[PDB]
Amino acid sequence: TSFLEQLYVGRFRWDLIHPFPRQDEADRRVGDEVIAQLRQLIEDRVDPDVVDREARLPDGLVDELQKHGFLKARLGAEFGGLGLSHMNLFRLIEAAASWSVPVALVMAIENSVGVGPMHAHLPAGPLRDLVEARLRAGTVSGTADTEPAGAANHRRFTTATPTEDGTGYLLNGEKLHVGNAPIAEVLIVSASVVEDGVEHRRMFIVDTDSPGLRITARHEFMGVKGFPNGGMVFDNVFVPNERMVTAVAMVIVGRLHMIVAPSLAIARQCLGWSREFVRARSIDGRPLGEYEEIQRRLAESAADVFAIEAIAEWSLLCWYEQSAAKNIGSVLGWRVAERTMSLLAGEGYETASSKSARGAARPFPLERALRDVRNFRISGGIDFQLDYWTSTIAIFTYYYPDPDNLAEIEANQVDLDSLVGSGLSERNERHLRHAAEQARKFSRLCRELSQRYPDLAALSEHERKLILIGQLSNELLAVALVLARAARLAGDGQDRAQALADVFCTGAGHRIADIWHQLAEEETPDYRSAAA
Amino acid sequence: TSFLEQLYVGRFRWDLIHPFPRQDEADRRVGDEVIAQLRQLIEDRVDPDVVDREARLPDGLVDELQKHGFLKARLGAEFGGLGLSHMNLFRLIEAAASWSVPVALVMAIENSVGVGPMHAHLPAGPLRDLVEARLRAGTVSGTADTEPAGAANHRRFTTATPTEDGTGYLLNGEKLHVGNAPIAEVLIVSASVVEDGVEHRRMFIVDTDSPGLRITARHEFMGVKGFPNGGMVFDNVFVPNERMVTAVAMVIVGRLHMIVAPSLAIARQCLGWSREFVRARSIDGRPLGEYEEIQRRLAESAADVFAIEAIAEWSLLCWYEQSAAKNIGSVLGWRVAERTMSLLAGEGYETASSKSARGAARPFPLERALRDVRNFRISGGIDFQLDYWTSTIAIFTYYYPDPDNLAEIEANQVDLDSLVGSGLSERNERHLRHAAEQARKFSRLCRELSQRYPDLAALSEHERKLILIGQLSNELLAVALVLARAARLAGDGQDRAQALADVFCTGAGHRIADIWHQLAEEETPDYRSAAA
Numbered sequence A, B: 001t002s003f004l005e006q007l008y009v010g011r012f013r014w015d016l017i018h019p020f021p022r023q024d025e026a027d028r029r030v031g032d033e034v035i036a037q038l039r040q041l042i043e044d045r046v047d048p049d050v051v052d053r054e055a056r057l058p059d060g061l062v063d064e065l066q067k068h069g070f071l072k073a074r075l076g077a078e079f080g081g082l083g084l085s086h087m088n089l090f091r092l093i094e095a096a097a098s099w100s101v102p103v104a105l106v107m108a109i110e111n112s113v114g115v116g117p118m119h120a121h122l123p124a125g126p127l128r129d130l131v132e133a134r135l136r137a138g139t140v141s142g143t144a145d146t147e148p149a150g151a152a153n154h155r156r157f158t159t160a161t162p163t164e165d166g167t168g169y170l171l172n173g174e175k176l177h178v179g180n181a182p183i184a185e186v187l188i189v190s191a192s193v194v195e196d197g198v199e200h201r202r203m204f205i206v207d208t209d210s211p212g213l214r215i216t217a218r219h220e221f222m223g224v225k226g227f228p229n230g231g232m233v234f235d236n237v238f239v240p241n242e243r244m245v246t247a248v249a250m251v252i253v254g255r256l257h258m259i260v261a262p263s264l265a266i267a268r269q270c271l272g273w274s275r276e277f278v279r280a281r282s283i284d285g286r287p288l289g290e291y292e293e294i295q296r297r298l299a300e301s302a303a304d305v306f307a308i309e310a311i312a313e314w315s316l317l318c319w320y321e322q323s324a325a326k327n328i329g330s331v332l333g334w335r336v337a338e339r340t341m342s343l344l345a346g347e348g349y350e351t352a353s354s355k356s357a358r359g360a361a362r363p364f365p366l367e368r369a370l371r372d373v374r375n376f377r378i379s380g381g382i383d384f385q386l387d388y389w390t391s392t393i394a395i396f397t398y399y400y401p402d403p404d405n406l407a408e409i410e411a412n413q414v415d416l417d418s419l420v421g422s423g424l425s426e427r428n429e430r431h432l433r434h435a436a437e438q439a440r441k442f443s444r445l446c447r448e449l450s451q452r453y454p455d456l457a458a459l460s461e462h463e464r465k466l467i468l469i470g471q472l473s474n475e476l477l478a479v480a481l482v483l484a485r486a487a488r489l490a491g492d493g494q495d496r497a498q499a500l501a502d503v504f505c506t507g508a509g510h511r512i513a514d515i516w517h518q519l520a521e522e523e524t525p526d527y528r529s530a531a532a
């Protein structure tokens, strides 16, 4: 069953996550070999600073990645693929992202939500034969969903009308901010088909060379400069019947690769840059690493990385937890980069090329890292919006008919007896007790709100409270997995894991308290008067 | 006396800030005229997007600013200056920053810490005659203090050794990240003179064309692209005796212009961009401005702007409050820009030129605003470092001998009777009661820490606690001034002020609670093990 699903009804399932899993040693060594090959390739052909300054990937890179099976990492030998586990794909994207995020994002889309991953789901027919033929030949793909109207719209205004002769459909509409679009051979397009008065969302496998399809825009953002990203108009684009697809777990697990892997990569580089800077600097004769606040900030960044690692390992060694991984990964990644900017200060704010030009010891592209990491709280959904959707669509669903374990909620039941054998420190066992108590409190809150509003549609109006509840659920999951991983790695002789776990749960402790304080607001201000 | 100084010893001096001052109407109308002239000039000659993309100001701008007295805004008619009040200079920089921050920063340095502002302090002699001659002719200046060693160092390693013939000094050392350096005619340089075994910090008025002075580096950062910023080597630069200066209120009040004015400008543009985006967008048939979370976020940004306005008006209509204005202004400015990025989402992350290229309705340079605003938590000191220095150098100084008002601290004395006549709402009067109680609690905390460590040097080791205390003092000042300004503007018929005040104090309420929770930490984790 599901740890986070149980957490929503106030159960702290230590037994589901302890002992914390670890990657198979043979599988990890297969990862090590493929990662070494990619690093050789991109370090030879890609200068990340030049890619950022020119906002362009070097000519020939996508080809060379294709020839070595890096755009078919999860496919079998049949397709000239590397047949990597999810854990090893994630590590491959992480490895790419630590050099150039644009390169990582191209690889992430293709190996996550492209026609390659989709192949296995398609039924036998012409479409499946075409995708296979393209994959053998080597293809680049993208998902074209977002419209100017907004991604958060339940409807898609891009229409698919059947042709008079019934052979295919005419696509009409606009797609915005589409990853890989400018280099894509084929796009997975979302469009509405009207069937006798009722609108229906359908997916279409559309060639980019289709007449009436126009890549009008090439999008450049604050970060990920060089990442192929395009907007397009469909003007009566003819799409044969077979090209119409005829689950969403592929999209959720895809976020681990597209969002969390690059977030971890950046968080790791930032920790590296923090340590190198602290090692080489001093204030008033005393080396910078001796000042308490500097020590705490290195600890907090190190603990954040450990937490991104925990959520990533739990997600890919094995559902709702993988949904929360998007926000936990992206936010922790952004925090580390923000913290690192404060630490490196003036040098941190300075561009890599500027520092390189003046022969600086540390030409670290931290400012690029901070601009890039911001993407991952936007791309794949806005953090507060995902926090809202998580609590209304996945937390109050268990309470609206009524909670099945309602007796447990009124009784304030907390199983402290199942946390007895851990291997955790006396402090990390205290963190574990408190998280289990907070789990039960979380459910009691959810019950009061559900009792307070009979209609969910009415409850769904109170967005701030539901966002905070989304956040609270993520904090407790992060604490739980961090303690589980700590117990495991400490058990296998990594004693630093206890300290890292201790730092993170202490911090989470303050964020949880803050979230409760905001939830406990009795009277709301007239924010509508203020907004005007 | 000083409101913030009294706040440090737990006194809430409502009587010192109520009624809140307002700018003289005649003075403000003089501001309106000068601001209109600057806007005409820069809107004609400066394209802010081009300045950002090329990281260069257009040729001739500094001249045209000089010819119209914008680099001598606070000087008298004698010098061809505009003789503006501090409040009007701040508004002039704000007006410039709302168009192009680089332009604002050049003007801010010259009108704050340049040779122009310094003129009045200099004693009669050749140096004063030279500065006057330069100011009449039109000059550009900068302060060269920061060295590769770090700005936070008490010592400066740049040396000034007297010449054998005793006519002047030889300057040797390196300065980093110097504003206006590449366009400066003269620089105010910090350097150490050794007098019979004891080091001494001295200021030198050095011409940039001095042989042995080399502008080796031209610094480009994440934001403020185009802002002239240079690093230099001094190789036995000869400086005549008269060129050696022979208080720091000029630097503190300068921060209002260099840090807070551009922070307010960005915060205001961001609120404007938020409202325009919300007005034009809808989700599921419902316009975006009808969703609670959207309403709250517009309210929180509007309330933040109001708070930056409050600290700015209190600082320039009239010391320690002006020190805290740096952090309050910069942080609130950064929060608004961060909040705005989440709101505008994909469009928000996209560059102005990208959105312009594809004929977007809103080619808003939000991403540029976010990159620029980050500067103001670094430039003029790192936010957490200023929070540390504020509590060790300006909060515990009143408690180390002992607190003069110790009786008040033990007695938990809170004057609720002086807050009776305000004009505030019943909610904003509650906010006022709570701030006065938090003021007293703040002093009781400070007493316990002072009692706990007999030696300040020992107390100064505990950096996290002292930073949090710095933060707590700033939050209560912000609440106090917001309520004071609200009472005044509501009294003069602006009823929205009550709502804006209410939004801000509610938010501050949560930040204060969070700060206390972190202060109340009983046992600390082993962060030194984690840092490694």
Ligand SMILES: Cc1cc2nc3c(=O)[nH]c(=O)nc-3n(C[C@H](O)[C@H](O)[C@H](O)COP(=O)(O)OP(=O)(O)OC[C@H]3O[C@@H](n4cnc5c(N)ncnc54)[C@H](O)[C@@H]3O)c2cc1C
Binding pocket: A142, A143, A144, A145, A146, A149, A150, A151, A152, A153, A176, A177, A178, A179, A180, A221, A224, A229, A375, A378, A379, A380, A381, A382, A384, A385, A463, B281, B283, B288, B291, B292, B293, B294, B342, B343, B344, B345, B346, B347, B349
């Ligand atoms: C680098 C990058 C790459 C991308 N690549 C792709 C891609 O390959 N394919 C693709 O399809 N898309 C892609 N996107 C689009 C991205 O997923 C969207 O930008 C994002 O999911 C939503 O952005 P939007 O501008 O459409 O926001 P909207 O959905 O319009 O939201 C606008 C604002 O309103 C808020 N809001 C929305 N609904 C509510 C509500 N009910 N209550 C309160 N507030 C609400 C949102 O949180 C947001 O702050 C990419 C984006 C980026 C930045």
Ligand SMILES: Cc1cc2nc3c(=O)[nH]c(=O)nc-3n(C[C@H](O)[C@H](O)[C@H](O)COP(=O)(O)OP(=O)(O)OC[C@H]3O[C@@H](n4cnc5c(N)ncnc54)[C@H](O)[C@@H]3O)c2cc1C
Binding pocket: A281, A283, A288, A291, A292, A293, A294, A342, A343, A344, A345, A346, A347, A349, B142, B143, B144, B145, B146, B149, B150, B151, B152, B153, B176, B177, B178, B179, B180, B221, B224, B229, B375, B378, B379, B380, B381, B382, B384, B385, B463
């Ligand atoms: C755009 C820009 C313009 C600038 N213009 C000028 C200018 O015109 N003139 C000028 O002189 N300078 C200028 N500066 C320099 C700027 O003021 C400094 O960068 C800043 O004050 C300190 O930066 P630093 O790199 O020297 O940091 P450092 O002082 O080396 O600090 C390094 C880190 O250590 C931390 N730290 C320091 N002391 C302690 C302590 N005791 N305990 C714990 N942690 C500590 C700091 O908070 C920081 O995080 C400019 C900077 C920028 C970004």
